[PDB]
Design brief:
This is part of a larger assembly, with two copies of chain A. Chain A is 46% helix and 14% strand. In chain A, strands 3-2-1-4 form a four-stranded mixed β-sheet. Chains A and B meet through strand 2 of A and helix 1 of B. Chain A: This is Expressed protein.
Amino acid sequence: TELEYVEEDSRLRKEKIELIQKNYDNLNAKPLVGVDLYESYSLVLNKSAWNYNEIIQRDTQLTILDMALQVHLFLYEGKIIDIAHIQKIIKTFVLNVFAKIIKGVPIVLNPIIIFDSVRFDKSKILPVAVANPKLMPPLGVQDWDTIVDEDEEIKKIVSTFIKLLENALTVGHEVEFFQDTLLVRNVDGITSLYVSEKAAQVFNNSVIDQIMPEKPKYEALEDPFS
Amino acid sequence: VDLYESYSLVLNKSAWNYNEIIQRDTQLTILDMALQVHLFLYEGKIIDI
């Protein structure tokens, strides 16, 4: 074959390599920042808010709609399950977790991720995600199964959501768990929960004035465009 | 590190839980267990509470 054709092929391959590099470059990203010890609520909140804002502006995170659609596709065996129903169920489950963790009760969704809360003073609490400790078992841990209705459909939907969440965290996604928060898995098996300003505001409102978020309702899907 | 890795955070959580249960005033003291033991053992020999 023509030597120039081979040269053009190699040139195209190197062009694709340079496109790979430029594709990584065009995602204008900065390394996530963190601290080493729990000292003040304000400092940790500032770091978490900055991390959440950075991940949001990166636009690489999976919202609740994405997980609802993954569950809807994964549970298909002949009959269609409503996406809005699954989204409502997932929101109800995460709100149950939220209500359970503000009372000092950790919730275990899996051997890897355990949802807990850190309070520094009255009126100052912050949700966290921690791994299973090795020598000091957590105080009053409850399974997720405790806070889920006994109906088979509800339990299957929540189990599928948990499994898909674990897979998404393992592969390297950034999933949203509470409203305006983000769940990430860093190096090794360390998980972190980054809280926006309004999410921390709703946490503080719940802890100071007992203003619980309203129950999720069935919302019809909105057209993503226009 | 994690909230469990330090003495102060775990102590604060434990103290908050204990204070909440104490302020509910629903816990059984040692006197209650002594009286239950006295009642359970009240048919072999009476033991002072």
